Amino acid sequence: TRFTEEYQLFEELGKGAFSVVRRCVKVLAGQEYAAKIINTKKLSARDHQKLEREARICRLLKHPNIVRLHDSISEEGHHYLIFDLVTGGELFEDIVAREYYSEADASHCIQQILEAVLHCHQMGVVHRDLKPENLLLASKLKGAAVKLADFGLAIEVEGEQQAWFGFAGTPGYLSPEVLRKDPYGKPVDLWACGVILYILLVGYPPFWDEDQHRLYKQIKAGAYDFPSPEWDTVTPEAKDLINKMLTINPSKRITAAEALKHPWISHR
Amino acid sequence: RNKLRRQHSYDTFVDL
Ligand SMILES: Nc1ncnc2c1ncn2[C@@H]1O[C@H](COP(=O)(O)OP(=O)(O)O)[C@@H](O)[C@H]1O
């Protein structure tokens, strides 16, 4: 209808699930964006429901540490999500390349992540799929902002009202309440944040096993620890935050607001 | 110890 008229396609940034991201400019404005080009014809019934949800949910979110959706356009057989341009790749590839972060850089990183999650929550959005793969870096430059992305699995919540919103997310990062098929809500994002912080500081995750059955046992039991030697020189307040985030009871589990007031985030 | 590999998003329970 109206993308072909205002936007000029440019070079490919990446491929995906019947998607192709190109750099684009809004011609008249001159400003440059990322256009996620989705093929309607090759999408499942279920995939359309997500696209619509992703579009609706992303529209609510204006924050410096969320990837902004500026526009969502439906033409014949093709759907275009117009996003902020981000040129730094995934937090994932950066953790792999640097192996692990200092307590300094881990604090700065998760602080931005927690401000992204806090905004989401205050707008009644639970993400459900926090992982390094779904965090992107603004640019290739120094101290570039971490921006939350991929709201394809995100749900809307009314206040603090828990419910069974379905089994959704990434095995390693799922919360015990989801594994227990309990009604859940905002606290599930804070368990994922736990997993991300742990990964940030030693470069491996707190819960693993070849057998998905066993991985889920560990997570439900909160069976993680802080092995020697790599954890020995890591502050007890760093660990204190992880424990407070990796609390198997979501009621006693720390919130985004609380986590940001935690002494390991707040001062330094 | 466990090492860090990339994990995919599921939208349903899929026993693996
Ligand atoms: N706003 C953006 N700016 C630049 N590259 C992006 C942007 N959004 C996504 N990409 C990249 O485009 C490729 C496909 O992204 P997309 O299909 O939206 O999600 P996913 O990477 O989870 O499949 C990846 O390389 C991703 O990092």
PDB file of C-alpha atoms and ligand atoms in Angstrom:
ATOM      1  CA  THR A   1       0.000   0.000   0.000  1.00  0.00           C
ATOM      2  CA  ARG A   2       2.333   2.776   1.367  1.00  0.00           C
ATOM      3  CA  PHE A   3       5.934   1.412   2.049  1.00  0.00           C
ATOM      4  CA  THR A   4       7.036   1.361  -1.646  1.00  0.00           C
ATOM      5  CA  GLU A   5       6.147   5.147  -1.685  1.00  0.00           C
ATOM      6  CA  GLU A   6       8.006   6.447   1.465  1.00  0.00           C
ATOM      7  CA  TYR A   7      10.927   3.913   1.851  1.00  0.00           C
ATOM      8  CA  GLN A   8      13.933   2.941  -0.384  1.00  0.00           C
ATOM      9  CA  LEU A   9      15.445  -0.573   0.128  1.00  0.00           C
ATOM     10  CA  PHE A  10      19.287  -0.911   0.456  1.00  0.00           C
ATOM     11  CA  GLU A  11      21.848  -3.655   1.404  1.00  0.00           C
ATOM     12  CA  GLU A  12      20.959  -6.924   3.269  1.00  0.00           C
ATOM     13  CA  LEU A  13      21.702  -6.940   7.079  1.00  0.00           C
ATOM     14  CA  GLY A  14      20.532 -10.589   7.662  1.00  0.00           C
ATOM     15  CA  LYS A  15      18.108 -13.476   6.785  1.00  0.00           C
ATOM     16  CA  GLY A  16      15.614 -15.386   9.021  1.00  0.00           C
ATOM     17  CA  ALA A  17      12.291 -17.313   9.332  1.00  0.00           C
ATOM     18  CA  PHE A  18      10.907 -16.285   5.857  1.00  0.00           C
ATOM     19  CA  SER A  19      12.216 -12.736   6.704  1.00  0.00           C
ATOM     20  CA  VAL A  20      15.050 -10.619   5.144  1.00  0.00           C
ATOM     21  CA  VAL A  21      16.316  -7.477   7.008  1.00  0.00           C
ATOM     22  CA  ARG A  22      17.617  -4.669   4.705  1.00  0.00           C
ATOM     23  CA  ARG A  23      18.846  -1.158   5.629  1.00  0.00           C
ATOM     24  CA  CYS A  24      16.240   1.354   4.285  1.00  0.00           C
ATOM     25  CA  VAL A  25      15.848   5.188   4.256  1.00  0.00           C
ATOM     26  CA  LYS A  26      12.492   7.034   4.575  1.00  0.00           C
ATOM     27  CA  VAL A  27      13.240   9.038   1.367  1.00  0.00           C
ATOM     28  CA  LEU A  28      11.648  12.436   2.240  1.00  0.00           C
ATOM     29  CA  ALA A  29      12.814  12.425   5.932  1.00  0.00           C
ATOM     30  CA  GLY A  30      16.229  11.034   4.777  1.00  0.00           C
ATOM     31  CA  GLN A  31      16.563   9.052   8.105  1.00  0.00           C
ATOM     32  CA  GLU A  32      17.833   5.406   7.812  1.00  0.00           C
ATOM     33  CA  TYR A  33      16.128   2.350   9.458  1.00  0.00           C
ATOM     34  CA  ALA A  34      16.109  -1.502   9.380  1.00  0.00           C
ATOM     35  CA  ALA A  35      13.155  -2.953   7.367  1.00  0.00           C
ATOM     36  CA  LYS A  36      12.286  -6.564   8.433  1.00  0.00           C
ATOM     37  CA  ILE A  37      10.674  -7.903   5.169  1.00  0.00           C
ATOM     38  CA  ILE A  38       8.332 -10.894   5.969  1.00  0.00           C
ATOM     39  CA  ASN A  39       6.759 -13.255   3.332  1.00  0.00           C
ATOM     40  CA  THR A  40       2.968 -13.531   4.136  1.00  0.00           C
ATOM     41  CA  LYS A  41       2.477 -16.340   1.500  1.00  0.00           C
ATOM     42  CA  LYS A  42       4.933 -18.796   3.241  1.00  0.00           C
ATOM     43  CA  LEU A  43       3.772 -18.031   6.886  1.00  0.00           C
ATOM     44  CA  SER A  44       1.717 -20.493   9.050  1.00  0.00           C
ATOM     45  CA  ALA A  45      -1.640 -19.557  10.698  1.00  0.00           C
ATOM     46  CA  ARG A  46       0.308 -19.387  14.023  1.00  0.00           C
ATOM     47  CA  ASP A  47       3.130 -17.167  12.532  1.00  0.00           C
ATOM     48  CA  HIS A  48       0.580 -14.457  11.429  1.00  0.00           C
ATOM     49  CA  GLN A  49      -0.835 -14.339  15.030  1.00  0.00           C
ATOM     50  CA  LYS A  50       2.759 -13.631  16.318  1.00  0.00           C
ATOM     51  CA  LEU A  51       3.530 -10.996  13.609  1.00  0.00           C
ATOM     52  CA  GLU A  52       0.280  -9.160  14.659  1.00  0.00           C
ATOM     53  CA  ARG A  53       1.226  -9.568  18.381  1.00  0.00           C
ATOM     54  CA  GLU A  54       4.909  -8.520  17.818  1.00  0.00           C
ATOM     55  CA  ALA A  55       3.575  -5.408  15.928  1.00  0.00           C
ATOM     56  CA  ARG A  56       0.923  -4.495  18.583  1.00  0.00           C
ATOM     57  CA  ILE A  57       3.303  -5.060  21.583  1.00  0.00           C
ATOM     58  CA  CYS A  58       6.395  -3.320  20.018  1.00  0.00           C
ATOM     59  CA  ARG A  59       4.225  -0.176  19.302  1.00  0.00           C
ATOM     60  CA  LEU A  60       3.722   0.378  23.114  1.00  0.00           C
ATOM     61  CA  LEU A  61       7.507   0.459  23.852  1.00  0.00           C
ATOM     62  CA  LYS A  62       9.477   3.780  23.658  1.00  0.00           C
ATOM     63  CA  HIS A  63      12.821   3.241  25.553  1.00  0.00           C
ATOM     64  CA  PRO A  64      16.548   3.787  24.717  1.00  0.00           C
ATOM     65  CA  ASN A  65      17.363   0.081  25.595  1.00  0.00           C
ATOM     66  CA  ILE A  66      14.480  -1.381  23.482  1.00  0.00           C
ATOM     67  CA  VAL A  67      14.742  -1.630  19.629  1.00  0.00           C
ATOM     68  CA  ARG A  68      12.026   0.881  18.520  1.00  0.00           C
ATOM     69  CA  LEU A  69       9.364  -0.144  15.939  1.00  0.00           C
ATOM     70  CA  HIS A  70       8.544   3.066  13.940  1.00  0.00           C
ATOM     71  CA  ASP A  71       6.082   1.523  11.417  1.00  0.00           C
ATOM     72  CA  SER A  72       4.372  -1.792  10.417  1.00  0.00           C
ATOM     73  CA  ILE A  73       3.026  -2.024   6.796  1.00  0.00           C
ATOM     74  CA  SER A  74       1.004  -4.776   4.970  1.00  0.00           C
ATOM     75  CA  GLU A  75       1.370  -4.890   1.110  1.00  0.00           C
ATOM     76  CA  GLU A  76       0.483  -7.864  -1.228  1.00  0.00           C
ATOM     77  CA  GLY A  77       2.328 -10.974   0.128  1.00  0.00           C
ATOM     78  CA  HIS A  78       4.971  -8.908   2.052  1.00  0.00           C
ATOM     79  CA  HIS A  79       4.903  -7.330   5.589  1.00  0.00           C
ATOM     80  CA  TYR A  80       7.510  -4.659   6.616  1.00  0.00           C
ATOM     81  CA  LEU A  81       8.515  -3.944  10.262  1.00  0.00           C
ATOM     82  CA  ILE A  82      10.485  -0.616  10.276  1.00  0.00           C
ATOM     83  CA  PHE A  83      12.918  -0.600  13.271  1.00  0.00           C
ATOM     84  CA  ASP A  84      15.803   1.495  14.627  1.00  0.00           C
ATOM     85  CA  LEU A  85      18.998   0.511  12.713  1.00  0.00           C
ATOM     86  CA  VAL A  86      21.342  -1.519  15.035  1.00  0.00           C
ATOM     87  CA  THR A  87      24.853  -2.379  13.681  1.00  0.00           C
ATOM     88  CA  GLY A  88      26.583  -4.078  16.706  1.00  0.00           C
ATOM     89  CA  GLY A  89      25.073  -7.603  16.367  1.00  0.00           C
ATOM     90  CA  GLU A  90      23.761  -9.811  19.253  1.00  0.00           C
ATOM     91  CA  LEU A  91      24.982  -9.626  22.898  1.00  0.00           C
ATOM     92  CA  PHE A  92      25.490 -13.424  22.309  1.00  0.00           C
ATOM     93  CA  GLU A  93      28.254 -13.045  19.637  1.00  0.00           C
ATOM     94  CA  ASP A  94      29.960 -10.410  21.906  1.00  0.00           C
ATOM     95  CA  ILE A  95      29.962 -12.756  25.005  1.00  0.00           C
ATOM     96  CA  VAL A  96      31.379 -15.594  22.783  1.00  0.00           C
ATOM     97  CA  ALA A  97      34.094 -13.275  21.290  1.00  0.00           C
ATOM     98  CA  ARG A  98      35.075 -11.766  24.718  1.00  0.00           C
ATOM     99  CA  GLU A  99      34.354 -15.106  26.559  1.00  0.00           C
ATOM    100  CA  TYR A 100      33.171 -13.152  29.697  1.00  0.00           C
ATOM    101  CA  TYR A 101      32.760  -9.544  31.049  1.00  0.00           C
ATOM    102  CA  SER A 102      34.292  -7.772  34.117  1.00  0.00           C
ATOM    103  CA  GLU A 103      31.913  -7.075  37.093  1.00  0.00           C
ATOM    104  CA  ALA A 104      32.048  -3.419  35.847  1.00  0.00           C
ATOM    105  CA  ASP A 105      30.827  -4.239  32.271  1.00  0.00           C
ATOM    106  CA  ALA A 106      28.390  -6.980  33.509  1.00  0.00           C
ATOM    107  CA  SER A 107      26.786  -4.359  35.865  1.00  0.00           C
ATOM    108  CA  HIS A 108      26.499  -1.711  33.056  1.00  0.00           C
ATOM    109  CA  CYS A 109      25.121  -4.426  30.659  1.00  0.00           C
ATOM    110  CA  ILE A 110      22.430  -5.929  32.972  1.00  0.00           C
ATOM    111  CA  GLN A 111      21.469  -2.409  34.275  1.00  0.00           C
ATOM    112  CA  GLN A 112      20.385  -1.455  30.692  1.00  0.00           C
ATOM    113  CA  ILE A 113      18.659  -4.901  30.302  1.00  0.00           C
ATOM    114  CA  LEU A 114      16.776  -4.330  33.650  1.00  0.00           C
ATOM    115  CA  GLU A 115      15.648  -0.792  32.523  1.00  0.00           C
ATOM    116  CA  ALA A 116      14.386  -2.388  29.230  1.00  0.00           C
ATOM    117  CA  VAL A 117      12.512  -5.145  31.217  1.00  0.00           C
ATOM    118  CA  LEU A 118      11.164  -2.530  33.738  1.00  0.00           C
ATOM    119  CA  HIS A 119       9.685  -0.385  30.903  1.00  0.00           C
ATOM    120  CA  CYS A 120       8.164  -3.584  29.351  1.00  0.00           C
ATOM    121  CA  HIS A 121       6.559  -4.499  32.743  1.00  0.00           C
ATOM    122  CA  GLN A 122       5.182  -0.942  33.467  1.00  0.00           C
ATOM    123  CA  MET A 123       3.463  -1.118  29.994  1.00  0.00           C
ATOM    124  CA  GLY A 124       2.051  -4.605  30.916  1.00  0.00           C
ATOM    125  CA  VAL A 125       4.426  -6.548  28.582  1.00  0.00           C
ATOM    126  CA  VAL A 126       6.173  -9.779  29.714  1.00  0.00           C
ATOM    127  CA  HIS A 127       8.941 -10.719  27.181  1.00  0.00           C
ATOM    128  CA  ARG A 128       9.211 -14.480  28.096  1.00  0.00           C
ATOM    129  CA  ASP A 129      12.349 -14.934  25.867  1.00  0.00           C
ATOM    130  CA  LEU A 130      15.242 -12.882  27.406  1.00  0.00           C
ATOM    131  CA  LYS A 131      18.591 -14.280  26.098  1.00  0.00           C
ATOM    132  CA  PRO A 132      21.887 -12.894  24.666  1.00  0.00           C
ATOM    133  CA  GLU A 133      20.545 -13.873  21.159  1.00  0.00           C
ATOM    134  CA  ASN A 134      17.583 -11.400  21.615  1.00  0.00           C
ATOM    135  CA  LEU A 135      19.737  -8.475  22.928  1.00  0.00           C
ATOM    136  CA  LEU A 136      21.473  -6.384  20.167  1.00  0.00           C
ATOM    137  CA  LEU A 137      24.214  -3.674  20.461  1.00  0.00           C
ATOM    138  CA  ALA A 138      23.473  -0.193  18.933  1.00  0.00           C
ATOM    139  CA  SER A 139      26.813  -0.026  16.986  1.00  0.00           C
ATOM    140  CA  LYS A 140      30.313  -1.671  16.770  1.00  0.00           C
ATOM    141  CA  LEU A 141      31.635   1.318  18.908  1.00  0.00           C
ATOM    142  CA  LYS A 142      32.730   1.468  22.625  1.00  0.00           C
ATOM    143  CA  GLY A 143      30.013   1.241  25.371  1.00  0.00           C
ATOM    144  CA  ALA A 144      27.212   1.001  22.718  1.00  0.00           C
ATOM    145  CA  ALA A 145      23.696   0.651  24.282  1.00  0.00           C
ATOM    146  CA  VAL A 146      22.264  -2.905  24.735  1.00  0.00           C
ATOM    147  CA  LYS A 147      18.777  -2.924  23.071  1.00  0.00           C
ATOM    148  CA  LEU A 148      16.121  -5.650  23.755  1.00  0.00           C
ATOM    149  CA  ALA A 149      14.529  -7.168  20.577  1.00  0.00           C
ATOM    150  CA  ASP A 150      12.436 -10.156  19.268  1.00  0.00           C
ATOM    151  CA  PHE A 151       8.989  -9.613  20.939  1.00  0.00           C
ATOM    152  CA  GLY A 152       7.548 -12.507  18.831  1.00  0.00           C
ATOM    153  CA  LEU A 153       6.801 -14.504  22.071  1.00  0.00           C
ATOM    154  CA  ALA A 154       5.832 -11.452  24.258  1.00  0.00           C
ATOM    155  CA  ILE A 155       2.404 -11.314  26.049  1.00  0.00           C
ATOM    156  CA  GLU A 156       0.288  -8.431  27.474  1.00  0.00           C
ATOM    157  CA  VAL A 157      -0.639  -8.650  31.227  1.00  0.00           C
ATOM    158  CA  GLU A 158      -3.369  -6.699  33.158  1.00  0.00           C
ATOM    159  CA  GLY A 159      -1.643  -5.322  36.308  1.00  0.00           C
ATOM    160  CA  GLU A 160      -0.026  -8.150  38.393  1.00  0.00           C
ATOM    161  CA  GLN A 161      -2.663 -10.804  37.376  1.00  0.00           C
ATOM    162  CA  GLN A 162      -0.820 -14.167  36.895  1.00  0.00           C
ATOM    163  CA  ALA A 163      -2.188 -16.785  34.404  1.00  0.00           C
ATOM    164  CA  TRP A 164      -1.063 -19.818  32.331  1.00  0.00           C
ATOM    165  CA  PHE A 165      -0.017 -17.913  29.130  1.00  0.00           C
ATOM    166  CA  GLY A 166       1.431 -21.164  27.621  1.00  0.00           C
ATOM    167  CA  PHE A 167       4.796 -23.027  27.339  1.00  0.00           C
ATOM    168  CA  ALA A 168       6.983 -20.550  25.362  1.00  0.00           C
ATOM    169  CA  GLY A 169      10.638 -19.375  25.391  1.00  0.00           C
ATOM    170  CA  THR A 170      14.113 -20.992  25.280  1.00  0.00           C
ATOM    171  CA  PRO A 171      14.772 -24.157  27.360  1.00  0.00           C
ATOM    172  CA  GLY A 172      17.957 -22.870  29.107  1.00  0.00           C
ATOM    173  CA  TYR A 173      16.270 -19.542  30.099  1.00  0.00           C
ATOM    174  CA  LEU A 174      12.726 -20.760  31.092  1.00  0.00           C
ATOM    175  CA  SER A 175      11.470 -20.174  34.701  1.00  0.00           C
ATOM    176  CA  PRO A 176      10.440 -22.955  37.159  1.00  0.00           C
ATOM    177  CA  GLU A 177       6.760 -21.706  37.186  1.00  0.00           C
ATOM    178  CA  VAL A 178       6.566 -22.293  33.350  1.00  0.00           C
ATOM    179  CA  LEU A 179       8.319 -25.719  33.768  1.00  0.00           C
ATOM    180  CA  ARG A 180       5.758 -26.507  36.588  1.00  0.00           C
ATOM    181  CA  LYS A 181       2.911 -25.262  34.252  1.00  0.00           C
ATOM    182  CA  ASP A 182       1.938 -22.658  36.941  1.00  0.00           C
ATOM    183  CA  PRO A 183       0.162 -19.344  36.248  1.00  0.00           C
ATOM    184  CA  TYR A 184       3.065 -16.871  35.677  1.00  0.00           C
ATOM    185  CA  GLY A 185       3.741 -13.220  34.731  1.00  0.00           C
ATOM    186  CA  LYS A 186       6.369 -10.446  35.112  1.00  0.00           C
ATOM    187  CA  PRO A 187       8.750 -12.481  37.364  1.00  0.00           C
ATOM    188  CA  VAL A 188       9.677 -14.953  34.480  1.00  0.00           C
ATOM    189  CA  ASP A 189      11.756 -12.166  32.773  1.00  0.00           C
ATOM    190  CA  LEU A 190      13.773 -11.751  36.055  1.00  0.00           C
ATOM    191  CA  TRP A 191      14.748 -15.497  36.102  1.00  0.00           C
ATOM    192  CA  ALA A 192      16.074 -15.066  32.503  1.00  0.00           C
ATOM    193  CA  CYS A 193      17.994 -11.936  33.704  1.00  0.00           C
ATOM    194  CA  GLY A 194      19.523 -14.193  36.412  1.00  0.00           C
ATOM    195  CA  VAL A 195      20.740 -16.645  33.685  1.00  0.00           C
ATOM    196  CA  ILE A 196      22.091 -13.716  31.562  1.00  0.00           C
ATOM    197  CA  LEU A 197      24.074 -12.213  34.531  1.00  0.00           C
ATOM    198  CA  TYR A 198      25.636 -15.637  35.405  1.00  0.00           C
ATOM    199  CA  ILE A 199      26.598 -16.120  31.676  1.00  0.00           C
ATOM    200  CA  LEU A 200      28.060 -12.531  31.564  1.00  0.00           C
ATOM    201  CA  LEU A 201      30.507 -13.109  34.497  1.00  0.00           C
ATOM    202  CA  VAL A 202      32.074 -16.561  33.657  1.00  0.00           C
ATOM    203  CA  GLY A 203      30.951 -17.020  29.990  1.00  0.00           C
ATOM    204  CA  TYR A 204      28.972 -20.299  30.578  1.00  0.00           C
ATOM    205  CA  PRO A 205      25.326 -20.771  31.744  1.00  0.00           C
ATOM    206  CA  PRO A 206      24.198 -21.906  35.243  1.00  0.00           C
ATOM    207  CA  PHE A 207      21.934 -24.788  33.966  1.00  0.00           C
ATOM    208  CA  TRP A 208      22.992 -27.324  31.268  1.00  0.00           C
ATOM    209  CA  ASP A 209      22.474 -31.007  30.327  1.00  0.00           C
ATOM    210  CA  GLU A 210      22.349 -32.970  26.997  1.00  0.00           C
ATOM    211  CA  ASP A 211      18.930 -34.325  28.242  1.00  0.00           C
ATOM    212  CA  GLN A 212      16.170 -31.594  28.258  1.00  0.00           C
ATOM    213  CA  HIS A 213      14.426 -33.691  31.014  1.00  0.00           C
ATOM    214  CA  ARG A 214      17.513 -33.225  33.308  1.00  0.00           C
ATOM    215  CA  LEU A 215      18.030 -29.477  32.414  1.00  0.00           C
ATOM    216  CA  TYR A 216      14.403 -28.838  33.562  1.00  0.00           C
ATOM    217  CA  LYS A 217      15.022 -30.878  36.808  1.00  0.00           C
ATOM    218  CA  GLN A 218      18.050 -28.590  37.600  1.00  0.00           C
ATOM    219  CA  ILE A 219      16.068 -25.363  36.797  1.00  0.00           C
ATOM    220  CA  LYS A 220      12.946 -26.469  38.817  1.00  0.00           C
ATOM    221  CA  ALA A 221      15.310 -27.389  41.739  1.00  0.00           C
ATOM    222  CA  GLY A 222      17.416 -24.185  41.155  1.00  0.00           C
ATOM    223  CA  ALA A 223      20.453 -26.561  40.971  1.00  0.00           C
ATOM    224  CA  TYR A 224      23.216 -24.022  40.061  1.00  0.00           C
ATOM    225  CA  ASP A 225      26.441 -23.131  41.990  1.00  0.00           C
ATOM    226  CA  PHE A 226      29.563 -20.841  41.731  1.00  0.00           C
ATOM    227  CA  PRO A 227      32.451 -23.265  40.875  1.00  0.00           C
ATOM    228  CA  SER A 228      36.149 -22.645  41.809  1.00  0.00           C
ATOM    229  CA  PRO A 229      38.361 -21.144  40.571  1.00  0.00           C
ATOM    230  CA  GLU A 230      36.574 -18.768  38.076  1.00  0.00           C
ATOM    231  CA  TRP A 231      33.906 -17.661  40.705  1.00  0.00           C
ATOM    232  CA  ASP A 232      36.401 -17.324  43.672  1.00  0.00           C
ATOM    233  CA  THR A 233      37.383 -13.647  42.827  1.00  0.00           C
ATOM    234  CA  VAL A 234      33.706 -12.582  42.165  1.00  0.00           C
ATOM    235  CA  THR A 235      32.087 -10.284  44.815  1.00  0.00           C
ATOM    236  CA  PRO A 236      29.472 -11.789  47.211  1.00  0.00           C
ATOM    237  CA  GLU A 237      27.088  -8.911  46.176  1.00  0.00           C
ATOM    238  CA  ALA A 238      27.342 -10.061  42.488  1.00  0.00           C
ATOM    239  CA  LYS A 239      26.320 -13.602  43.648  1.00  0.00           C
ATOM    240  CA  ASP A 240      23.710 -12.030  46.035  1.00  0.00           C
ATOM    241  CA  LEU A 241      21.922 -10.429  43.005  1.00  0.00           C
ATOM    242  CA  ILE A 242      21.999 -13.719  40.976  1.00  0.00           C
ATOM    243  CA  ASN A 243      20.483 -15.704  43.952  1.00  0.00           C
ATOM    244  CA  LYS A 244      17.803 -12.957  44.376  1.00  0.00           C
ATOM    245  CA  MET A 245      17.051 -13.282  40.574  1.00  0.00           C
ATOM    246  CA  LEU A 246      17.377 -17.162  40.456  1.00  0.00           C
ATOM    247  CA  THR A 247      14.776 -17.608  43.291  1.00  0.00           C
ATOM    248  CA  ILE A 248      12.506 -20.612  42.325  1.00  0.00           C
ATOM    249  CA  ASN A 249       9.487 -18.967  44.116  1.00  0.00           C
ATOM    250  CA  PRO A 250       8.506 -15.988  41.884  1.00  0.00           C
ATOM    251  CA  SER A 251       6.789 -14.233  44.896  1.00  0.00           C
ATOM    252  CA  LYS A 252      10.110 -13.919  46.844  1.00  0.00           C
ATOM    253  CA  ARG A 253      11.928 -13.319  43.470  1.00  0.00           C
ATOM    254  CA  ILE A 254      13.446  -9.789  43.054  1.00  0.00           C
ATOM    255  CA  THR A 255      11.675  -7.378  40.606  1.00  0.00           C
ATOM    256  CA  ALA A 256      13.170  -5.140  37.838  1.00  0.00           C
ATOM    257  CA  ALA A 257      12.544  -2.046  40.075  1.00  0.00           C
ATOM    258  CA  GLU A 258      14.286  -3.732  43.097  1.00  0.00           C
ATOM    259  CA  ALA A 259      17.163  -5.179  40.946  1.00  0.00           C
ATOM    260  CA  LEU A 260      17.965  -1.602  39.698  1.00  0.00           C
ATOM    261  CA  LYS A 261      18.096  -0.324  43.354  1.00  0.00           C
ATOM    262  CA  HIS A 262      20.520  -3.264  44.245  1.00  0.00           C
ATOM    263  CA  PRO A 263      23.920  -1.876  45.449  1.00  0.00           C
ATOM    264  CA  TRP A 264      25.828  -3.863  42.717  1.00  0.00           C
ATOM    265  CA  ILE A 265      23.813  -1.932  40.000  1.00  0.00           C
ATOM    266  CA  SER A 266      22.943   1.448  41.683  1.00  0.00           C
ATOM    267  CA  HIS A 267      26.332   2.846  42.930  1.00  0.00           C
ATOM    268  CA  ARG A 268      28.871   1.449  40.350  1.00  0.00           C
TER     269      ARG A 268
ATOM    270  CA  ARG B   1      32.378 -25.951  32.492  1.00  0.00           C
ATOM    271  CA  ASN B   2      29.003 -26.100  30.564  1.00  0.00           C
ATOM    272  CA  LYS B   3      30.287 -23.732  27.745  1.00  0.00           C
ATOM    273  CA  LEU B   4      27.871 -21.296  25.939  1.00  0.00           C
ATOM    274  CA  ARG B   5      25.994 -22.469  22.760  1.00  0.00           C
ATOM    275  CA  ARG B   6      23.033 -20.611  21.076  1.00  0.00           C
ATOM    276  CA  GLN B   7      19.455 -21.799  21.862  1.00  0.00           C
ATOM    277  CA  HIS B   8      16.279 -21.384  19.681  1.00  0.00           C
ATOM    278  CA  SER B   9      12.802 -20.046  20.714  1.00  0.00           C
ATOM    279  CA  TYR B  10       9.866 -22.554  20.889  1.00  0.00           C
ATOM    280  CA  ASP B  11       6.212 -21.288  20.927  1.00  0.00           C
ATOM    281  CA  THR B  12       4.917 -24.704  22.265  1.00  0.00           C
ATOM    282  CA  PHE B  13       6.117 -27.529  24.577  1.00  0.00           C
ATOM    283  CA  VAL B  14       8.310 -29.825  22.391  1.00  0.00           C
ATOM    284  CA  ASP B  15       9.781 -32.792  24.394  1.00  0.00           C
ATOM    285  CA  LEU B  16      13.462 -32.921  23.238  1.00  0.00           C
TER     286      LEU B  16
HETATM  287  N1  LIG C   1      17.137  -3.356  13.661  1.00  0.00           N
HETATM  288  C1  LIG C   1      18.058  -4.144  13.113  1.00  0.00           C
HETATM  289  N2  LIG C   1      19.185  -3.582  12.620  1.00  0.00           N
HETATM  290  C2  LIG C   1      20.112  -4.381  12.075  1.00  0.00           C
HETATM  291  N3  LIG C   1      20.113  -5.702  11.941  1.00  0.00           N
HETATM  292  C3  LIG C   1      18.990  -6.237  12.447  1.00  0.00           C
HETATM  293  C4  LIG C   1      17.946  -5.546  13.033  1.00  0.00           C
HETATM  294  N4  LIG C   1      16.955  -6.426  13.443  1.00  0.00           N
HETATM  295  C5  LIG C   1      17.412  -7.606  13.107  1.00  0.00           C
HETATM  296  N5  LIG C   1      18.640  -7.565  12.494  1.00  0.00           N
HETATM  297  C6  LIG C   1      19.425  -8.705  12.028  1.00  0.00           C
HETATM  298  O1  LIG C   1      18.766  -9.298  10.931  1.00  0.00           O
HETATM  299  C7  LIG C   1      18.905 -10.742  10.991  1.00  0.00           C
HETATM  300  C8  LIG C   1      17.540 -11.375  11.130  1.00  0.00           C
HETATM  301  O2  LIG C   1      16.794 -10.713  12.187  1.00  0.00           O
HETATM  302  P1  LIG C   1      15.260 -11.106  12.470  1.00  0.00           P
HETATM  303  O3  LIG C   1      14.769 -12.005  11.381  1.00  0.00           O
HETATM  304  O4  LIG C   1      14.479  -9.871  12.789  1.00  0.00           O
HETATM  305  O5  LIG C   1      15.411 -11.956  13.821  1.00  0.00           O
HETATM  306  P2  LIG C   1      16.320 -13.230  14.204  1.00  0.00           P
HETATM  307  O6  LIG C   1      17.752 -12.785  14.040  1.00  0.00           O
HETATM  308  O7  LIG C   1      15.970 -13.565  15.635  1.00  0.00           O
HETATM  309  O8  LIG C   1      15.933 -14.319  13.230  1.00  0.00           O
HETATM  310  C9  LIG C   1      19.892 -10.994  12.139  1.00  0.00           C
HETATM  311  O9  LIG C   1      21.242 -10.952  11.686  1.00  0.00           O
HETATM  312  C10 LIG C   1      19.581  -9.816  13.064  1.00  0.00           C
HETATM  313  O10 LIG C   1      20.612  -9.582  13.999  1.00  0.00           O
END
